[PDB]
Design a protein around this ligand. Structure first.
Ligand SMILES: NC(=O)[C@H]1CCCN(C(=O)Nc2cc3c(cc2Cl)OCO3)C1
Ligand SMILES: [Zn+2]
Length: 139
């Protein structure tokens, strides 16, 4: 689990969104596994606006942060789950690292701010849903 709080928005994995996220829906994209809902309280996370490929992510299955090199946002095949059939997930970035399903929502950050959230795992790889292109998150 985990979310990003920026302004009047909450960003979560679409497969983990609550009834409240759906009742206050702003935008959702199944191909990206992202959902954004509106909040009453003001969020203070800074979203990065960069092309960084190095950062640090939070891994809850290890209670630890790990430094990683990650790929550029791209369309990558993701195996079937209780949430989606087998498909290409867009805007996905991979890194060599530890991830379990419960790790989804852990934030990836660079020196410029929040890059994205854990969205896939397995085989000694971790996938992050990128959020840096969502320029409207700030306005
Ligand atoms: N973005 C998606 O489609 C997600 C939906 C939830 C499930 N997603 C996963 O990748 N699960 C997963 C499977 C694993 C694993 C780690 C993870 Cl995070 O290690 C053993 O098997 C895809
Ligand atoms: Zn950066």
């Amino acid at each position: 689990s985990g979310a990003i709080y920026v302004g009047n928005y909450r960003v979560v994995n679409r497969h983990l969104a609550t009834h409240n996220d759906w009742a206050n829906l702003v935008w959702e994209d199944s191909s990206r596994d992202l959902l954004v809902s509106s909040t009453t309280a003001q969020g203070c996370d800074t979203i990065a606006r960069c092309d960084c490929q190095t950062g640090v992510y939070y891994c809850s299955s290890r209670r630890k942060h790990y430094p990683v090199s990650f790929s550029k946002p791209s369309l990558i095949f993701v195996e079937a789950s209780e949430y989606y059939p087998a498909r290409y997930q867009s805007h996905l970035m991979l890194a060599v690292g530890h991830s379990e399903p419960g790790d989804c929502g852990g934030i990836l950050r660079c020196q410029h701010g929040v890059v994205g959230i854990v969205s896939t795992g397995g085989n000694g790889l971790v996938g992050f849903a990128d959020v840096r292109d969502l320029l409207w998150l700030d306005e």
